[PDB]
Ligand binder design. Structure first.
Ligand SMILES: OC[C@H]1O[C@@H](O[C@H]2[C@H](O)[C@@H](O)[C@H](O)O[C@@H]2CO)[C@H](O)[C@@H](O)[C@H]1O
Lengths: 135, 135
């Protein structure tokens, strides 16, 4: 399908950056993720880790700093379904990331690391990607 | 009847604010516009005047301060077509507005007036507005 998708962001990202991700959640998906990483090394810091878990019915947001994960935040319910397509907008603003799913504001994740450290977007897990666009 | 559509921006707009306009260009459309205004009074300043012209086949960007227009910036081609539907994204960033038309970054307009004064959205002219959503 789309396999782990990687998009580089050399200049980083600033408030007013929009990540639009469209794809399908396959019939037997357990979970997938969208990470905003700070480098290409494995286990690199994550300004944001968005993780819809269909197997447990939760959507988790977290960060990873200096090798250790922070405290997990959970969104309101699971707006994703196995066998259904989706569209997610992850908008960077001054104070955090707005996560919009299916045309509705879903969760706001206050910044934990400086937006300026982000260098790569990675998408992986049980999802079949249509497209990942960054505006 | 061409009564323009008017939409309030309750918390105003800041870097990270996304305007999503969906519509369809009428068959005999001449031109249409999206205005970001600073007040509800006829003749208020326009932080942004985005005006695609099918007849002159050119898209004009411009601001209007204290009654008079300013330096007009044109964009690359006409990403709109008569009788066809379009989806436009206007993204406010720290240094300007990014206009995205159907999956592609179209033009970047640097702030002339301050984001802080913008208070409403106006869409008028030859266009069938389907919806305006602010994220
Ligand atoms: O500046 C935006 C403003 O343009 C007016 O038309 C301009 C036009 O851009 C230019 O080709 C010509 O030389 O001058 C005209 C008038 O100053 C439009 O009439 C107005 O609706 C806006 O779109």
């Amino acid at each position: 399908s789309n396999v782990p998708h990687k998009s580089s962001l050399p200049e980083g990202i600033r408030p007013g950056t929009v990540l639009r991700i469209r794809g399908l959640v396959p019939p037997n998906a357990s979970r997938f993720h969208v990470n905003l990483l700070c480098g290409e090394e494995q286990g690199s810091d994550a300004a944001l880790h968005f993780n819809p878990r269909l197997d447990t019915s939760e959507v988790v947001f977290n960060s990873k700093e200096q090798g250790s994960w922070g405290r997990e935040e959970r969104g309101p319910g699971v707006p994703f379904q196995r066998g259904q397509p989706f569209e997610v907008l992850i908008i960077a603003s001054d104070d955090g990331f707005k996560a919009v799913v299916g045309d509705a504001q879903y969760h706001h994740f206050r910044h934990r690391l400086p937006l300026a450290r982000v260098r790569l977007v990675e998408v992986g897990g049980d999802v079949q990607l249509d497209s990942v666009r960054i505006f």
